[PDB]
């Protein structure tokens, strides 16, 4: 091996390692910045600025073990560490070199939460946490509990009581709310939140709009939403059901307000609570749908972008180690009061991918479009649908459906590496390079990606 400088670097090596305190690694800014966490100490290296890596020991507040999962906001600016009981959100000290100051050391412990904070009674455990994609300065996190309750905490505001959507029902049997959620996932418009429930074998529901305290919205996207909103309005007639008409109007209003209160400088906008509370839309219609899958259940769901114009492809796991690629063919309308709204909740099964192995968890690295990493059993395969999704992408803006004639919709399924423990991943662009950091427990592999 040319062993020039890969895998070997200041920030990546550290002995005196305990066979416990797991380690994590995250990229940021197109594989520029790096965040490494080991022995309860955070390391960050900016492969543009910084000449050497700087660190921070947070062992004083958190003692990482194996109940924790850590995730970093896309912007990279933040980190969230949680378990089925508590949440810790820390602000990576970019630009900071010395972080020794025992007082400034705490000016990074931005948010804390523990289920044992609710009065008394049965307190259900945390099932997953997410950073809200468009939550201006990553100020909002979404916590899903066992009671399928989805809660949004405004990390940077004590004066902000959390919002709790899809609350429990005093009824019995099936009602309105979405029961038995197995996985959460945001749309690439960052306004819709997809949910994968099990109750009926597995269907898809969604929260449109799922908003944060303050929305992160650039001008390109402000318009896009705004336009789609008008096209919707323009399309209303007489056949349009009342409830739908109602929403669409309410939608154009809300969005027409986003436009007024838009902050041109920063690129944010304040979203008043009303609009924030919303009832679940769903179930979506998957079509066509393989008769087999009715026996099995859904495992996970992920969203893979295929360009930049938010044109995405939904992805669902299944028991038979099957994967399906759906395409949202109809423009949704926002909803709020409506119990069991379904107006235009439709998906189209593009392709199916059988793997037969056990599908542990789906993962995607933003930076590389049309690519999905499926953590099989002891494998990690990279399903690449850029074969046809790049064509599907043109046919969309060209309003040309001919190129899709006799085109074969097969994902070039490759194989990354082998692992036992469900790995961690990251995209590093080292010297114009596609690097895939694979962090198993002890392991810490590095590879390349086709393109």
């Amino acid at each position: 091996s040319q062993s020039s400088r890969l895998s070997a670097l200041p920030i990546f090596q550290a002995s005196l390692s305990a066979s416990q305190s797991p380690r994590y690694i995250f990229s940021s800014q197109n594989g520029t910045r790096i965040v490494f966490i080991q022995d309860n100490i955070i390391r960050w290296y900016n492969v543009l600025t910084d000449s050497l890596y700087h660190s921070l020991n947070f062992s004083r507040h958190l003692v990482l073990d194996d109940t924790f999962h850590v995730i970093s906001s896309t912007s990279g600016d933040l980190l969230c560490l949680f378990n089925d009981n508590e949440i810790f959100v820390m602000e990576v000290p970019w630009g900071y070199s010395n972080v020794e100051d025992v007082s400034i050391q705490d000016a990074f412990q931005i948010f804390h939460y523990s289920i044992d904070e609710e009065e008394v009674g049965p307190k259900s455990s945390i099932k997953k946490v997410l950073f809200h994609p468009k939550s201006y300065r990553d100020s909002c996190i979404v916590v899903l509990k066992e009671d399928d309750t989805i809660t949004m905490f405004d990390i940077l505001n004590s004066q902000e009581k959390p919002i709790v959507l899809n609350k429990p029902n005093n009824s019995f049997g099936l009602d309105a709310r979405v029961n038995d959620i197995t996985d959460l996932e945001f749309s690439k418009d960052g306004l819709t939140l997809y949910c994968l429930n099990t109750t009926e074998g597995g269907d898809i529901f969604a929260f449109y709009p799922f908003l944060p305290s303050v929305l992160l919205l650039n001008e390109k996207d402000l318009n896009l939403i705004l336009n789609k909103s008008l096209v919707m309005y323009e399309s209303l007639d007489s056949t349009t059901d009342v409830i739908v008409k109602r929403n669409v109007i309410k939608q154009l209003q809300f969005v027409s307000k986003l436009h007024e209160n838009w902050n041109s400088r920063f690129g944010k906008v304040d979203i008043q609570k009303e609009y924030r509370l919303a009832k679940v839309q769903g179930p979506f219609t998957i079509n066509p749908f393989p008769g087999e899958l009715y026996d099995y259940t859904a495992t996970n769901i992920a969203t893979i972008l295929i360009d930049n114009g938010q044109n995405e492809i939904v992805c669902v796991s299944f028991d038979d180690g099957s994967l399906i690629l759906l395409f949202k063919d109809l423009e949704m309308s926002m909803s709020w009061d409506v119990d069991n709204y379904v107006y235009n909740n439709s998906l189209v099964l593009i392709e199916r991918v059988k793997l037969q192995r056990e599908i542990k968890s789906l993962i995607t690295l933003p930076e590389q479009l049309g690519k999905l990493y499926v953590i099989s059993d002891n494998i990690i395969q990279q399903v690449n649908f850029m074969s046809w999704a790049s064509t599907l992408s043109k046919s969309i803006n060209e309003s040309d459906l001919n190129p899709l004639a006799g085109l074969k919709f097969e994902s070039k399924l490759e194989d990354i590496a082998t692992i036992e423990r469900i790995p961690n991943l990251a995209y590093i662009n080292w010297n114009d390079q596609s690097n895939l950091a694979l962090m198993s427990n002890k392991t810490l592999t590095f590879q390349n990606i086709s393109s």
Partner: peptide
Amino acid sequence: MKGFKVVEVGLAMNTKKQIGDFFKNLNM
């Protein structure tokens, strides 16, 4: 008056729906 972008958006939207029919028949 006249529309410029918004029109394009509708085309796009419509097209996605057009694509919808593609896959609905392309299978069975």
